[PDB]
Amino acid sequence: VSAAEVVSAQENQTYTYVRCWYRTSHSKDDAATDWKWAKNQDGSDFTIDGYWWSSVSFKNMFYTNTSQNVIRQRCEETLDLANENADITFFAADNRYSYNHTIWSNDAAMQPDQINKVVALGDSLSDTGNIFNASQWRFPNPNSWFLGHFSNGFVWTEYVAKAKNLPLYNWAVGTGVGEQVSSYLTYTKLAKNYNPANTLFTLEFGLNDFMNYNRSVPEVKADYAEALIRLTDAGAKNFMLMTLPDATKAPQFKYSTQEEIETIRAKVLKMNEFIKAQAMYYKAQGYNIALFDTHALFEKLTSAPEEHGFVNASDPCLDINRSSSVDYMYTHSLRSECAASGADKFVFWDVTHPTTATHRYVAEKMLESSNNLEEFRF
Ligand SMILES: [Mg+2]
């Protein structure tokens, strides 16, 4: 995008409204959500000033001078739910028909030298709503998956961002990581006072490539190395990396052959050694890298769930008893064991994805790692 098209979009100042989403139930066993327009204390509609921009139709981001904390506070005050599990999220919307557009809060010209946002790249372990908006709010079904998250609540990146009180800008899609990098590079050219050294990047991918597309280990390794080359060349300094959990331990592989399981598992182990090597490579160059061994953690969770506060690591919480992508389009009841224990005691929500309690557990172990993240300046 041209420097003239950047200033041209920035000068096209308007306003929009804020859609405040929330979990309707007080229990995380129920994924259903609803929304209200953010209001001011006087009862008038809350608006934010700024400019829109999109590289392609309906894929709009709204850029505002208003901070994420001010917007979050307006939603909290408007909703007044007395719901400890409200799990509020918010977006820019002109009216009830708008998609859920991400609000980018522009940084100040005089930012201190400290991490001030999280930018996530990856797949369904990280997506907070991209494929959901792209599918017109149909995939995954919003009665059985929490508002576009492939789980019953927040994913690990949201828990990390929450713990550090940082805004989270998500590029993960439940379109490839190379395209997500290109998209991140394009949208941030429209951001004001953007310094990539103040961004904490999260990156996880490879499971979809091995599980769904049967991609070779070298091509996935090459794409991963490419994503880090492109981000570091564009000024990225801070990363949270993770090894891949062995997805063959998820319930969906009850329905796969042993030969398929062994193939995928072998690819995962090879990729994980490469991820560890990549983390070392960037650490050696002076980058701030936090590597967490999610693979080792999932081996423990799936072999001894009781040692980690879980009762079941073998079945989905949802009553899904097959592996079919069609199931993401429909509403499902919880299976009896999960309705009895609560979803906070199951490792898996559906046949593939962790519950939000597992996502929180992973986030907390990641936050602990590298001496409470001693190389990052928050
Ligand atoms: Mg490649």
XYZ file of C-alpha atoms and ligand atoms in Angstrom:
379
model
C 0.000 0.000 0.000
C 1.280 3.478 -1.091
C 2.265 6.174 1.485
C -0.356 8.409 -0.253
C -3.096 5.715 0.158
C -2.074 5.364 3.865
C -2.498 9.156 4.586
C -5.691 9.142 2.370
C -7.317 6.369 4.452
C -6.149 7.915 7.819
C -7.680 11.324 6.910
C -11.060 9.655 6.064
C -12.249 10.122 9.679
C -15.763 8.906 10.690
C -17.310 7.143 13.739
C -18.770 3.713 14.478
C -20.554 1.891 17.312
C -19.319 -0.914 19.595
C -20.975 -4.321 19.808
C -20.393 -5.851 23.299
C -20.648 -9.643 23.269
C -21.057 -11.792 26.369
C -21.730 -15.375 27.499
C -25.458 -15.599 28.402
C -25.018 -18.392 30.947
C -23.160 -18.100 34.257
C -21.590 -21.509 33.414
C -18.708 -22.122 30.937
C -20.558 -25.406 30.021
C -22.823 -23.218 27.859
C -21.144 -21.569 24.849
C -24.126 -19.350 23.845
C -23.573 -15.585 23.559
C -25.544 -12.426 22.948
C -24.641 -8.750 22.429
C -25.645 -5.169 23.306
C -24.472 -1.828 21.961
C -21.947 -0.128 24.267
C -23.498 2.877 26.040
C -22.153 5.975 27.865
C -23.166 6.543 31.563
C -26.023 8.877 30.437
C -27.575 6.033 28.357
C -26.564 7.444 24.943
C -24.872 5.104 22.429
C -21.075 4.953 22.762
C -19.201 5.792 19.563
C -15.526 5.730 18.632
C -13.871 8.033 16.081
C -11.460 6.758 13.439
C -11.011 5.317 9.977
C -11.791 2.061 8.209
C -9.537 0.115 5.896
C -9.726 -3.204 4.056
C -7.444 -5.025 1.626
C -10.548 -6.992 0.414
C -14.385 -6.471 0.795
C -15.999 -6.795 4.349
C -12.511 -7.624 5.857
C -12.498 -4.225 7.569
C -10.507 -3.060 10.560
C -11.512 0.133 12.369
C -8.553 2.238 13.593
C -9.217 4.476 16.595
C -7.416 6.822 18.946
C -9.613 5.377 21.795
C -7.736 2.813 23.943
C -8.922 -0.821 24.241
C -9.279 -0.391 28.068
C -11.754 2.530 27.645
C -13.842 0.428 25.173
C -13.733 -2.657 27.472
C -14.847 -0.492 30.460
C -17.822 0.897 28.431
C -18.880 -2.681 27.615
C -18.519 -3.820 31.259
C -20.567 -0.872 32.549
C -23.239 -1.233 29.831
C -23.699 -4.960 30.337
C -23.827 -4.866 34.184
C -24.406 -8.696 34.173
C -23.112 -9.859 37.634
C -21.711 -12.749 35.543
C -18.206 -13.859 36.502
C -18.070 -15.908 33.226
C -19.392 -13.052 30.987
C -16.097 -13.349 28.963
C -16.789 -10.075 27.204
C -15.412 -9.334 23.705
C -16.160 -6.310 21.500
C -16.047 -5.158 17.884
C -16.777 -2.154 15.651
C -20.170 -2.259 13.932
C -22.238 0.392 12.158
C -25.517 -1.547 12.724
C -27.035 -4.978 13.636
C -26.048 -6.400 10.172
C -22.309 -5.545 10.305
C -19.698 -8.308 10.688
C -17.631 -8.301 13.914
C -14.880 -5.874 12.851
C -11.678 -5.736 14.919
C -10.965 -2.354 16.527
C -7.259 -1.419 16.320
C -6.343 1.175 19.006
C -3.584 3.366 17.502
C -0.453 3.818 19.603
C 0.763 7.222 20.821
C 3.728 8.956 19.156
C 5.657 8.812 22.508
C 5.227 5.102 23.458
C 7.622 3.756 26.164
C 9.959 0.844 25.254
C 7.587 -1.929 26.368
C 5.290 -4.566 24.910
C 1.871 -2.935 24.424
C -0.099 -5.520 22.354
C -0.287 -9.154 21.317
C -0.496 -10.195 17.650
C -1.428 -13.839 17.100
C -0.784 -16.052 14.071
C -1.902 -19.619 13.684
C -4.814 -22.044 13.436
C -7.851 -23.245 15.468
C -5.786 -23.380 18.674
C -5.649 -19.535 18.425
C -8.524 -18.252 16.234
C -10.848 -15.836 18.108
C -13.299 -15.212 15.239
C -11.806 -15.005 11.730
C -13.280 -18.092 10.116
C -16.527 -17.382 12.072
C -16.939 -13.934 10.435
C -15.883 -15.373 7.025
C -18.598 -18.102 7.332
C -21.296 -15.492 8.171
C -21.402 -16.693 11.819
C -22.255 -20.294 10.906
C -18.918 -22.090 11.371
C -18.421 -23.093 14.224
C -22.068 -23.027 15.378
C -22.500 -20.263 18.020
C -24.755 -22.392 20.291
C -22.032 -25.075 20.826
C -18.728 -23.113 20.276
C -18.052 -19.782 21.965
C -18.545 -16.958 19.420
C -16.131 -18.142 16.720
C -13.625 -19.715 19.113
C -13.119 -23.491 18.603
C -13.786 -24.078 22.348
C -16.367 -23.256 25.065
C -14.575 -19.968 25.903
C -11.343 -18.018 25.480
C -8.276 -19.567 23.802
C -4.721 -19.466 25.220
C -3.694 -16.174 23.472
C -6.649 -14.349 25.096
C -5.677 -15.620 28.547
C -2.071 -14.496 27.941
C -3.226 -11.026 26.725
C -5.694 -10.774 29.691
C -3.028 -11.657 32.284
C -0.814 -8.815 30.944
C -3.828 -6.466 30.356
C -2.772 -6.182 26.683
C -4.992 -5.851 23.597
C -4.996 -8.961 21.374
C -5.079 -8.607 17.560
C -5.809 -11.970 15.993
C -4.745 -13.135 12.501
C -5.080 -16.891 13.294
C -7.694 -18.700 11.207
C -9.298 -22.001 12.194
C -6.038 -19.187 5.016
C -2.344 -20.091 5.586
C 0.200 -18.537 7.962
C 2.084 -16.982 4.978
C -1.133 -15.116 4.073
C -1.641 -14.149 7.762
C 1.887 -12.619 7.789
C 1.107 -10.704 4.539
C -2.218 -9.538 6.052
C -0.498 -8.421 9.324
C 2.119 -6.474 7.263
C -0.587 -4.820 5.159
C -3.003 -3.734 7.973
C -0.214 -2.408 10.249
C 0.951 -0.007 7.386
C -2.378 1.791 8.092
C -1.709 1.926 11.871
C -0.404 5.190 13.369
C 2.898 5.269 15.323
C 3.278 1.523 14.842
C 6.534 0.192 16.324
C 6.753 -3.651 15.799
C 9.347 -3.936 18.623
C 6.439 -3.284 21.094
C 4.383 -6.230 19.789
C 4.392 -9.674 21.433
C 3.905 -12.175 18.581
C 2.384 -15.610 19.174
C 2.857 -18.308 16.589
C 1.606 -21.889 16.355
C 0.925 -23.947 13.241
C 1.580 -27.251 11.548
C -1.202 -29.427 12.980
C -3.706 -28.526 10.232
C -0.992 -29.103 7.592
C -0.235 -32.633 8.876
C -3.800 -33.647 9.929
C -5.850 -32.261 6.998
C -3.558 -31.681 4.049
C -0.970 -34.531 4.540
C 1.838 -31.965 3.945
C 5.434 -33.122 4.189
C 7.530 -32.249 7.249
C 10.074 -30.183 5.119
C 7.375 -28.025 3.510
C 5.799 -27.216 6.903
C 9.291 -26.558 8.439
C 10.076 -24.239 5.457
C 6.789 -22.271 5.897
C 7.445 -21.867 9.650
C 11.037 -20.643 9.062
C 9.678 -18.285 6.338
C 7.084 -16.771 8.692
C 9.831 -15.971 11.278
C 12.213 -14.590 8.588
C 9.447 -12.296 7.261
C 8.332 -11.074 10.730
C 11.897 -10.475 12.041
C 12.854 -8.653 8.799
C 9.766 -6.426 9.387
C 11.003 -5.483 12.906
C 9.439 -8.205 15.132
C 11.556 -8.772 18.288
C 9.334 -10.640 20.808
C 7.809 -14.091 20.295
C 5.921 -16.740 22.227
C 6.526 -20.030 20.381
C 5.235 -23.483 21.248
C 5.780 -27.060 20.231
C 2.727 -28.798 18.813
C 0.562 -31.001 21.069
C 0.176 -34.534 19.750
C -3.286 -34.098 18.146
C -3.432 -37.935 17.686
C -4.251 -38.069 21.403
C -7.479 -36.094 20.732
C -10.848 -37.970 20.493
C -11.074 -37.533 16.713
C -8.295 -40.136 16.286
C -10.500 -42.826 17.909
C -11.935 -42.877 14.317
C -8.581 -42.962 12.461
C -6.426 -45.987 11.642
C -3.268 -46.781 13.665
C -1.163 -46.234 10.467
C -2.650 -42.671 10.096
C -2.005 -41.975 13.811
C 1.629 -43.154 13.588
C 2.236 -41.035 10.414
C 0.822 -37.824 11.977
C 2.581 -38.422 15.353
C 6.000 -38.957 13.608
C 5.489 -35.641 11.657
C 4.577 -33.812 14.902
C 7.754 -35.069 16.688
C 9.965 -34.013 13.755
C 8.329 -30.576 13.586
C 8.751 -30.073 17.376
C 12.521 -30.653 17.211
C 12.613 -28.032 14.367
C 10.518 -25.561 16.454
C 13.017 -25.966 19.332
C 15.925 -25.352 16.863
C 14.180 -22.211 15.455
C 13.622 -20.796 18.988
C 17.397 -21.356 19.702
C 18.349 -19.758 16.330
C 16.447 -16.518 17.101
C 17.498 -16.487 20.806
C 21.178 -16.713 19.581
C 20.620 -13.499 17.505
C 19.359 -11.514 20.459
C 15.600 -11.857 19.832
C 13.289 -12.303 22.874
C 11.923 -15.805 22.533
C 9.699 -17.645 25.019
C 9.382 -21.266 23.989
C 6.827 -23.437 25.776
C 6.757 -27.220 25.376
C 2.978 -27.683 24.783
C 3.772 -31.175 23.424
C 5.268 -32.280 26.813
C 2.329 -30.668 28.701
C -0.318 -32.472 26.559
C 1.472 -35.819 27.057
C 1.017 -35.308 30.831
C -2.622 -34.114 30.531
C -3.663 -37.046 28.322
C -1.785 -39.675 30.403
C -2.641 -38.445 33.922
C -5.491 -35.896 33.731
C -6.171 -36.283 37.539
C -2.689 -34.905 38.315
C -3.748 -31.667 36.562
C -7.307 -31.216 37.941
C -9.139 -32.923 35.020
C -11.420 -36.011 35.207
C -11.435 -36.931 31.480
C -8.865 -36.543 28.741
C -10.328 -39.214 26.395
C -13.765 -37.913 25.311
C -15.110 -34.600 24.033
C -17.284 -32.666 26.461
C -19.810 -32.339 23.553
C -21.718 -35.499 22.606
C -19.935 -35.877 19.249
C -19.079 -39.518 18.493
C -17.391 -39.337 15.039
C -15.003 -37.091 13.092
C -16.926 -34.983 10.506
C -16.399 -31.286 9.655
C -20.212 -31.117 9.203
C -20.621 -31.288 13.022
C -19.219 -27.721 13.313
C -22.439 -26.462 11.657
C -24.818 -27.890 14.285
C -25.814 -27.611 17.964
C -24.742 -30.504 20.239
C -25.700 -31.500 23.772
C -22.951 -32.186 26.349
C -22.325 -35.900 26.965
C -23.596 -37.162 30.373
C -20.081 -37.368 31.943
C -19.331 -33.769 31.026
C -22.753 -32.439 32.113
C -22.010 -34.210 35.496
C -18.361 -33.049 36.005
C -18.548 -29.644 34.307
C -16.570 -28.629 31.188
C -13.806 -27.237 33.467
C -12.899 -30.921 34.222
C -12.586 -32.117 30.576
C -9.419 -31.635 28.539
C -11.348 -31.623 25.202
C -14.413 -29.634 24.156
C -15.101 -31.288 20.845
C -13.275 -34.166 19.013
C -10.191 -31.964 18.330
C -10.041 -28.804 20.412
C -9.268 -28.186 24.071
C -11.836 -26.767 26.482
C -11.242 -23.227 27.734
C -10.025 -24.719 31.083
C -7.221 -26.517 29.094
C -6.499 -23.254 27.141
C -6.215 -21.367 30.499
C -3.951 -24.093 31.922
C -1.659 -23.859 28.861
C -1.670 -19.979 28.977
C -0.743 -20.048 32.732
C 2.184 -22.448 32.123
C 3.343 -20.232 29.258
C 3.189 -17.093 31.414
C 5.320 -18.882 34.101
C 7.992 -19.947 31.575
C 11.357 -18.111 30.932
C 11.291 -16.661 34.546
C 7.796 -15.027 34.362
C 8.928 -13.988 30.795
C 12.132 -12.153 32.061
C 13.395 -11.202 28.540
C 10.114 -9.411 27.646
C 9.578 -5.850 28.814
C 5.903 -5.412 29.838
Mg 6.697 -22.880 1.717
